[PDB]
């Protein structure tokens, strides 16, 4: 991954759903692209050979909890068990294990942020398409807001939101972006700041 070119971080929350996964990872693969993906702990037991697929395609995987509550609206013991529930099931289909966690809904506290223990990472771009279930208003809203470092965020489980993000990994990679995972943006944004370390010898 160049830093001095665009960079942009798709990211998809709430599967695997293998009819509508399994066609963004084809894009993605197709186009020469990766992606992150925020799955469900009960997703995964349910459908194992996804979670192998995106990793085997070089994409990454974050915890989205087990069964999507509110985090905020358990207790601590029991968001925490929701988390480590899905990590034990990703590590026990795949040896991964996940750093990044995507809160349902983005509900998150102080507590639950320095017990779980991990990478929160959410997104800059909704264009909300669990409301608008529509494949050209969900391509027109991403692509008027894309941007250089800029994270997406589109749930992988329907049929619009698939077909949707073939056409968004299209223009995007048309236009030039290179398509990263969340930690691979993380880590060209540092190579970015990076540069201001040449004032010292200047
Ligand atoms: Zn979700």
């Known amino acids: 991954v ?15 759903n293998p009819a509508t996964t399994n066609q963004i990872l084809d894009s993605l693969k197709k186009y020469k692209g990766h992606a992150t993906f925020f799955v469900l702990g009960s997703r995964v037991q349910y459908y194992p050979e996804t979670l192998i697929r995106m990793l085997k395609e070089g994409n990454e995987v974050g915890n989205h909890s087990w069964s999507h509550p509110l985090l905020t609206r358990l207790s601590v013991k029991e968001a925490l068990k929701q988390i480590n529930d899905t990590q034990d099931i ?15 809904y983005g509900g998150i506290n102080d507590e639950l942020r320095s017990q779980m223990k991990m990478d929160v990472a959410l997104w800059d771009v909704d264009p909300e398409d669990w409301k608008d279930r529509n494949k050209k208003t969900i391509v027109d809203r991403v692509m008027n807001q894309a941007g250089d470092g800029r994270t997406i965020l589109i749930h992988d489980i329907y049929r619009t939101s698939a077909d949707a993000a073939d056409e968004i990994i299209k223009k995007l990679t048309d236009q030039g972006y290179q398509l990263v995972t969340v930690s691979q943006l993380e880590e060209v944004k540092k190579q970015r700041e990076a540069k201001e370390l040449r004032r010292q010898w200047s």
Not at 4 to 12: D, G, H
């Open 90 to 104: 990703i590590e026990k289909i795949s040896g991964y294990r996940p750093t990044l966690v995507r809160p349902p």
């Open 2 to 16: 160049d830093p001095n070119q665009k960079v942009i971080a798709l990211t998809f929350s709430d599967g695997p």
